[model samples]
Target: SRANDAPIVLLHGFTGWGREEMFGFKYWGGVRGDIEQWLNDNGYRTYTLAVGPLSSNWDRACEAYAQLVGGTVDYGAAHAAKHGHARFGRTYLGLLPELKRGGRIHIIAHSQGGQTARMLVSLLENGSQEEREYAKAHNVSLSPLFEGGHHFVLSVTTIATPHDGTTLVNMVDFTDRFFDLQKAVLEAAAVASNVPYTSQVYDFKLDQWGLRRQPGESFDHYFERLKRSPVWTSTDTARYDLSVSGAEKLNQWVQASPNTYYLSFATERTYRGALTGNYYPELGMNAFSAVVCAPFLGSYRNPTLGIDDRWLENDGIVNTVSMNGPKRGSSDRIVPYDGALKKGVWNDMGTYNVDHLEIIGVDPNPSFDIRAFYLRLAEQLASLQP
Candidate 1:
C-alpha cells in the first residue's frame, strides 16, 4: 500500500542504534517511541540504517550504500588493507529491490549521520574516479554507487548536523595527550577484565576522523607502514572530514544536487546575550552535555578554524551556524528559517531550543513530543513533489 510513496530512511548519529533495537532502546525516537515503526503505522514506508558507530564517513557511507543497493560491504581493498579490518561486512542482498525499480527514498539523518548521507549521495551522483580505476585495475567489481546517475534519492533532511564541522573536534584535538592517556588506561582495564577495548572518544578523534596518510604512498605501502605505527588503527578517515579543515575539504567534493531538495534543522541550547552581542554558550546545555562540552568552550580560540564567539553557541554537541547548512559561496549561502521550503539549496528549518539528545527524544519531556514532531515532519516531506 505504501509502495506509491517514497520510502523514508532514518540515519542515526554517533554511537546510535539501528534495526536491531538493542536493549529495548530506540535510537531515533528514544524513550518516547520507535520512530520507524510509528512512521510505518502512519502509512509511510520507512527503515533505519545501521552504520558504523565510529567508522569514517566514507566507510559508513559505503556500508549504507551496500544496504540500500543490496550488496556486500566493500571498504575497498586499499581501505581495508590500511585499516586492518575485513574488507567485507554484512550483506543485505535484495534488501530494497524496489528501489532499483524506479522507487525513490527520502533521507532524515542526525549529526554525523548527515555527513554519511551526504557522502553516499556524492558517491552515487559522482562515482569516485580513483575508486573506479582501482577496482578495474584489481579486477574487482565496482559498486553501483560509483556508476553515478543514482536518481533514487528525492530529498535529504539533516537534523542538527554539523554541516560546517564542530568545535568539538578542535577541543578533542587540543586535549590529545589527555585522551591518549585515557585510551591507554581503558585498554589496560579492558585487557584485565577480558573484554574488548574500544575507546569511542579516541576513535572519534584519531581513528575515525582525519585523512592522515602520507603523500605519494601506495595503498599497500601505506598499509604496511600504518600497520607498524601506534596510530594505525585510526582508520575512519572521517575525523579529518568532521574537523573545520576537513569539512571544508569535503564541501568542495560533496555538493547538493539540483534534483533533490535539502532541509536542515539547527538547535541551540546556549543563551544569546542581547546586551553584549555574545552567546553565553554553556548556559543552555543539560548536565551531561554541559560537562562534555565545558572544556571545548573554555579552551578553543582558533580564528582560522571559525572557533570564536559565534561558534560558542551550540546545542551541546554542534554549533548552530554549522548546522544551518554547507557554505557554497556568498551567493549560495544557507537560507534562513522563514517557514518556506525550497529545492536545490538548503532550506533552514529554524533553530530549536533543545539539546542534542532532546532533539532525538532520548529523555522524555512534557513540553516536547518527539513522536508528533516526526509524524508532522514525515507528512510535510511526503507532501513534497519528487
Candidate 2:
C-alpha cells in the first residue's frame, strides 16, 4: 500500500540553507542525513528537501518545496518572479494522485518551514481553481477533509519553534536601531535583509514571504500590506474554530484540521555564558538578547506587547522567550519586576542553555540522543494509514 512506503520530508529553518553549512557544518555530514539514516534503518524512507542557499527568500524556498514533493510545474516568468523559481511549481493535491497510486508523504519542518507547511496545506484546501489546477499537473493532492476525504496524515514536530512570535525579534529590531551605524560598515551588502547587526530594521517582517516593502517603508504600511500577504502574523493567518469555544489563532497553523496529529517540542536552559567564550558576565546579557530586558534596564526600548517575559532566557542569539512562542503576561516592553535570573517552565533538551546554532549543529547528535528521537518518529509513521 502507498501508506506502507510513505516518504518523510524534512524542512530546515530561517537563514538555514539546505546544506551542512546551515548549522555551520558542526554535525557529521549534517543532522538531516544522519537522522534520515536512523529512520531508514528503523523502516522509514526519508528525503531531506533542500531549498535555497544562504539568505533564500521564503516564498521562493517554498516554491522549491512544491517541486521536490513530485508536484506539477508551471513555466513562466511571473511564476518565477513572484515565486523563487519560475520553471516548476506543484500543489499538494497534485501530488496526491501519485501517492494514492503508491506514494505517501509526511512532513518534518523546522523553524519557518513549519510555518511554510501550514501555508501550503491551507492553499491546498482553499486555493483558487487556477492554483488547484497548477498543483494537479505536479502530482500534489488537496486534502479530502476540506473537500471530501483527508488524503494523508501529517505529523508536524518543531524544535524551539516560535509558534506565536519571538521576543528576540523585538530585541533584534531594537539592537539594529541602536547599532545601525556600526552595521552600515559591517554588513553593507546584506543590508537588503536586516538581521543581527544589519541596518534593515524591518527587513525580517518585510521580506517575510519575499515581499519587498521598500527600504524606508513604515511599520504601519508594512503591517497593512502584510494583512493580505501570505506571511503568517497575528492577522490573516489560518484559523480553527471547532465548537463554540472559538478557534485558536497562531503564527504557525496546526490542529485537528485535516485530522493532522501535531506535536511541538522546545528547549530552554539557564544562560551560563557564550560558547564562543567572548562576552563577560559583567557585560550584562547579550546585547541582542537583552533587548527583551531593555525596558527593565530603565528606558531602553518599548516592549513588543503580549510576549511572556518568562520565555526570555538567553542562548547568545534570541532568548528562550522569543525563540519559543508567546506566553501569558509576556510583554513587548520590560517591566520593573523583570529579573535576569528568572527561569521559565520550559526545559531545554540538551546541555547548557544551548545557543540557536547548537539546536541544529554539525554533531547532529547533541548531548541528547536524536537517533532515538528518529526511531520514535518512525514508530509513529508506521502506525499511520493513507
Candidate 3:
C-alpha cells in the first residue's frame, strides 16, 4: 500500500493529450494498456491531466492550476496583455477540487510536461511578479496561482524530460504544419493498427488564443487553421520552449522548491561510435522520426550555445544529458538515488536503456515491462514522506 496519501498527477509531454483526446488512447499508456486504471485498481489514485498540446509552459502551467482546483484558466491579466491573447480560458470541473494545503499532490511528467510541471510548481511557490504588479496597477483580481505560497505540490518526477533543454529542437526541421502533420501521422498509424478509434476527437485546448475545434468542423480543416496560427511564430509554442535557449529562460525562474522532492528518469536510445565517439540511434528504433533525428543530434554542435560532444548523445528526440536536472540557467543540486529519498534536491535516477516513447509504453520490447515499471513507480511515489 501507500505510505504517502498524496495522489499522483500525471502530465504528458509535447503533443500529448488527456484521456478525453486521442480517441480514448491513454497518453500514459498507449496500445500496451492503461497505467492509470492499473494504478487505481492497485489501491493508488492517479489523475491524468490534459493541458494544451502545443501551448507554451506559461499557458500550460496556468491551465494546469485551474484544472486542479476547478475554475476557468486565468492566464494572468499581464501575461494576456503582453502576449495579445485573452486573459481567460475554458472552465474545468477539476480532478481534485477539494485539494488543500495538507492535501498536496505528487507530479509525474514526461517530455515537455516536465518543463510545464516545473513552471507550475514555481508559480505556486513564488507566484508571478509581473501578474501581481499588473493586477495591482489595473485594479484587477488575480488568480491564486499568481499569489505564491500555495505549496500545493509535494514531489516532481520527470521521465525523459529535457530540463536543460534539447538540441533536437534546433536540429529537427519542422515546418509551420509540423504539429498538424504529427496529428495526421498518429491518425494514419492508428488506422493501420489493430485497435479501432473511439468517438472522442483530440482536444487542442487552445481557447486562450481563440482557437478551438468548431462544431461540425472537420479535423483536417481545423488543423489547417492551426497551421496558420500566429502562435507558432510567437515565443508561446512548445518548440520554442523545448530549445536550449528557451529552457534556460524557464530555469531562471523555475527553481526547485525547498520543500518538494524532485526526481528524474533519463532514457537513451543512442549508441556511441567506436572511433568517432559520437552517438547514433540503435537499429530497430520504434519512431522513424527519432531515427532521422538521431544522426544530427548525435553529432551537431554550436559553441555559441555551449553545445559540445556531451550534447551529441540523445534518446532520438531529446539530449540524454539534458534530462537529469536543470543546470544551464539555474544551479540545482542533482544527486544519484541511493534507495533513500530527500526533498528540495533532484534525485538523479540513472538513464534507462530505452527510447522516449518506449518508456511511456507507446511501443516496447518483450523485455521491458511497462506495467511492472509503473507498479514499482507507484510503490516508490506512494512511499514518499508525508
Pick by lDDT: 2 or 3, better one? 3
Candidate 1 TM-score versus the reference: 0.79
lDDT of each: 0.67, 0.39, 0.82
Ranked candidates (TM-score, high to low): 3, 1, 2
| lDDT tens digits by residue: candidate 1, 1-386 | 12137889999766464544344456777656788899999887798887765467878888888788787777766566566656676677745777777888889999888888877877778877877777888888766776787777788899988888877766644334223322332232221212232322112212323323344433333334434443333535445556677677678778887777788988877776677545544443555456656345434567766567767677876777788787722233467656656667788888887777778866445576787888888887887776
- lDDT by residue (1-386, candidate 3, tens digit) is 46778999999888677786666777788767898999999888988888988899999999999899889999999989888899999898887877744578989999999999989999999999998999999999999999998988989999999998888777545553355435544653262212333343666778878887666666666666776785566788887888899999999889999888999999888889989978888865565545466777888899999999999888877899999999999878999999987899999988988887778877655677888988898889988886
Model 2 lDDT, residue 69, Cα:
39
Q: Could you tell me how far off, in angstroms, the CA of residue 306 lies in candidate 2 after the best superposition?
A: 1.3
TM-score of each: 0.79, 0.51, 0.93
The TM-score leader among the candidates is 3
Q: How many collisions per candidate?
A: 6, 35, 0
Backbone clashes in candidate 1 total 6
Q: After superposition, how far is residue 20 of candidate 3 from its true place, in Å?
A: 2.9
Displacement of residue 275 (Cα, Å) in model 2 is 23
Error of 3 at 255 (Å): 0.1
